[PDB]
Design a protein around this ligand. Structure first.
Ligand SMILES: [Cl-]
Ligand SMILES: [Cl-]
Lengths: 101, 101
């Protein structure tokens, strides 16, 4: 579901991802998602407009916008959070990646 | 480069992809792309709004919008076409996938 955050059932580069696909767009067995990376070890000079910082499980995470990809429903694990309150920033980041200024 | 079509240097599910990332968005060593599938064998009931049909090399191809993913510059092969003339349809398909109606 759009803006919901899930874990991967299979080993991957990242441990969490946010579903960003519209709920009215039907793609049987798959969903478009954006992985979340731990913000701790990462650099602060990285654009927050393109890579928003979110807070889940008492920690900060970076939305890896440019790592967007589709995942089969078979790898979608537990739902751990809901990022619908950051819709504005998520929307801005995605549009920026494709259409720029 | 945005809207340019390239071949994959490495074996993949598809043989062509269109770069859809903004030219002003810098992501060292990577680009966001959408694969193109041969339209011949495929079904005609599939939405053209979400999966535009393009013409390259005297054949028809379907833009696999929901198969969007980033690819490292190391796998980008020969540039074979330019789809900038279909910018409107490509833009509409991408926006539809994320924001729906
Ligand atoms: Cl947050
Ligand atoms: Cl065309």
């Amino acid at each position: 579901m759009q803006f919901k955050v899930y874990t991967y059932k299979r080993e991957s580069r990242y441990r969490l991802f946010v579903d960003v696909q519209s709920d009215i767009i039907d793609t049987p067995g798959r969903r478009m998602v954006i992985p979340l990376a731990s913000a701790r070890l990462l650099s602060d000079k990285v654009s927050r407009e393109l890579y928003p910082v979110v807070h889940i499980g008492d920690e900060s995470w970076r939305m890896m916008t440019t790592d967007m990809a589709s995942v089969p429903v078979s790898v979608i694990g537990e739902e751990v959070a809901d990022l619908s309150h950051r819709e504005n920033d998520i929307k801005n980041a995605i549009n920026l990646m494709f259409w720029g200024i």
